[PDB]
Write a protein that binds this ligand. Structure first.
Ligand SMILES: NC(=O)c1ccc[n+]([C@@H]2O[C@H](COP(=O)([O-])OP(=O)(O)OC[C@H]3O[C@@H](n4cnc5c(N)ncnc54)[C@H](OP(=O)(O)O)[C@@H]3O)[C@@H](O)[C@H]2O)c1
Ligand SMILES: NC(=O)c1ccc[n+]([C@@H]2O[C@H](COP(=O)([O-])OP(=O)(O)OC[C@H]3O[C@@H](n4cnc5c(N)ncnc54)[C@H](OP(=O)(O)O)[C@@H]3O)[C@@H](O)[C@H]2O)c1
Ligand code: NI
Ligand code: NI
Lengths: 389, 385
């Protein structure tokens, strides 16, 4: 079957290399002088990046106001605070300095700053953005690829909901990616980032078989590179080369260069979002737990996709085995690989038992059946949740 | 390595997507210059489809026909004049890489009060350009999604590449059906070209590029799997689709992030085609294996990795140089198996090797994997006789 008709468009300027925070003045010159600096819980102050950014913004002659304390799984209360700061200070441009939570929050602020309503209306697709403030990023954690896409995931902590939204208007104008700026990412979140970029590859790879041989190999190649790099990096967290490789693969994993011509599945991500909506756990910690059990649950729909991963990525020999046997062996080896890094493999790792599984499944089903490789209903989610206990 | 990646082109891919022209043209002006080549788009029926879409879009169409393979700068200057004559707002390139590259030179030339050859020779750096889009009819160059252009001066016998951030296509429409009528020889050439572009980006000394290496090796493997089937089934949608898709990725910059390509074989090829006007990738098939052999000693590990990962060479009991040389033979055998030439004699080409070497050396020493001088290119040309 022909690949799906597609449109690829990604206008983000990706700036990569050591010391490239010094590109900020040149990149800021064409935009207005009122800048909102958005950042998280303080790791950029301890790494020294905060003072470097402040120095560059001073050099750029801009008036700086700040939104500090964006939380992991950024909250819409934080977004609305940022929108208010944009209104209060008549902000022209936003600079996101942090991880995916900071970038995702900044996208929601940029769109929320052109909308006279609750920013949660944008997250829930009640209002489709027609304008947005421009923004850029300095990335401090390799994981989500948000530095080079137009998507954003926001939590409503009052309603215990976590949803992804997107807009062609909230691509970053530029993103500055220096491996040195990820050196202080702790081991646990270094592991999470690698789980996340691998999971993004899986999401884009699990589609019905069609004429995507080069896309398949780009996906398999990214997985092999991360698998080769991850054990070395976790034991050598200040290694420039190892951080560089993972920073690079994190961007390609979700900038759209892998998803041309094929609809991703994204069901495991939606289930994970429901778990993090209730318990606030790290996104990719939930992915490491859930993805292998989604793969087991959906295998009968077509074992051929997982079989190809099992053979090309996970070293399974297929001689004398059915496709289902090969695929199941591969899923075990994926789960073993993540566990060998120290990633969690059961919900009990986050002190999550079965008390709220019905609530979590309901939240996953809030928009009806979902998934493109297999359509999932409440019984399916529930089965995947129970297997992940 | 430090790098900057930026590519704002909207890539529109799929069957029947020429019908996207009205929506994509809506935000631009109504004076469109349609640029195309020697008439193959009329023989395919594509010309009439485009005219129908431009009529649907309500635009005033003027035409520049007859852009030649290895587009000549005289055609560019005529195109600039047509832009001034008819107050053109937007250019639509409908053809191959020659047509798109010519259209890029017209788009920039239309904002410069002088000969566009100044732009090709980098005497004038474009400060503005007209916007343009493309409908691609041949899978080869990747010009549909980059900011580069290669223009020939047929009076001086020169062929040079130039570029500008201002001449990315606004959009490019890629329908595999529009490559169905590409004849066997140019189908072969396109696949040789895209593989060569991968080789150019792969032969560098930048240390830490493991994923780029695999993206390159993956593209080569995909083309190798597809090419023998396609040359015997030229109207197969699936096979044309794969080659159209890999052709764009091979030179849209998605493979060269963090690594400066070598590009020496291309510069030597450009000198050959400047004198003899042969197909770009016909020269590449002849030259590239001998460039690979000539530069092997600089670092046998690069070609060795290609030999093992792409060309199925078993390394047990062999030196890196032995593995690499086996890989080069298999690359050359593969291209020959498609019908690509393997010697300069295939194009009735040693009387003009000194001239070709001079033109290749016109900008001094070149090459990133190995720095080449006149003696080097002369040796590669002779090995290619
Ligand atoms: N995708 C979505 O994006 C979000 C996940 O984004 P993410 O995986 O990039 O992680 P994140 O939620 O943006 O940050 C995870 C943790 O990493 C810390 N951090 C970030 N960069 C650091 C650095 N250079 N050095 C030390 N600590 C650093 C952060 O602490 P600080 O807050 O103190 O910076 C934070 O606690 C989720 O909401 C997901 O759904
Ligand atoms: N890169 C650079 O780009 C140029 C090479 O570009 P290229 O390899 O893409 O080839 P090209 O030079 O743009 O065209 C090569 C030949 O293929 C014909 N052609 C294009 N599309 C066709 C189609 N759908 N059906 C039948 N024939 C078709 C052209 O004939 P027509 O002129 O009649 O269209 C031309 O004669 C070189 O200058 C190279 O340096
Ligand atoms: Ni994710
Ligand atoms: Ni080429």
């Amino acid at each position: 079957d022909p690949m799906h008709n597609f449109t690829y468009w990604n206008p983000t300027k990706l700036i990569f290399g050591r010391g490239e925070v010094e590109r900020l003045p040149e990149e800021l010159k064409s935009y207005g002088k009122n800048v909102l600096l958005v950042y998280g819980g303080g790791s950029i102050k301890r790494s020294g990046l905060y003072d470097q950014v402040i120095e560059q913004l001073n050099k750029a002659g801009v008036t700086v106001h700040e939104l500090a304390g964006v939380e992991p799984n950024p909250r819409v209360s934080t977004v609305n605070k940022g929108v208010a700061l944009c209104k209060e200070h008549h902000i022209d441009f936003l600079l996101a300095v942090g991880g995916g939570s900071v970038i995702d929050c900044t996208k929601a602020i940029a769109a929320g700053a052109k909308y006279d309503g609750d920013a949660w209306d944008i997250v829930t697709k009640k209002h489709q953005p027609k304008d947005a403030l421009p923004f850029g990023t300095v990335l401090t954690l390799a994981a989500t690829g948000s530095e080079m896409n137009s998507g954003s995931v926001i939590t409503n902590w009052e309603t215990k909901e976590k949803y992804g939204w997107g807009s062609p208007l909230v691509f970053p104008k530029f993103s500055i990616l220096d491996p040195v700026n990820t050196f202080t990412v702790p081991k646990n979140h270094t592991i999470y980032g690698m789980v996340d970029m691998m999971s993004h590859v899986f999401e884009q790879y699990f589609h019905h078989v069609s004429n995507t041989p080069y896309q398949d190999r780009m996906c398999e190649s990214l997985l092999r590179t991360v698998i080769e790099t991850a054990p070395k990096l976790i034991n050598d967290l200040e290694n420039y080369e190892l951080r560089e490789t993972i920073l690079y693969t994190g961007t390609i994993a979700l900038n759209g260069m892998l998803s041309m011509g094929a609809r991703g599945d994204w069901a495991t991500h939606n289930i994970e979002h429901a778990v993090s909506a209730v318990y606030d756990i790290p996104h990719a910690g939930g992915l490491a737990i859930l993805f292998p059990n989604w793969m087991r649950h959906t295998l009968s729909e077509n074992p051929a996709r997982m079989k190809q991963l099992a053979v090309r990525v996970f070293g399974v020999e297929e001689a004398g085995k059915t496709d289902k046997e090969v695929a199941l062996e591969g899923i075990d080896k994926l789960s073993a690989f993540w566990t060998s890094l120290g990633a969690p493999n059961r919900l009990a790792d986050y002190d999550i038992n079965d008390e709220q599984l019905d609530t979590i499944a309901d939240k996953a089903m809030a928009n009806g059946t979902f998934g493109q490789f297999k359509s999932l209903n409440k019984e399916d989610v529930l089965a995947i949740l129970k297997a992940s206990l």
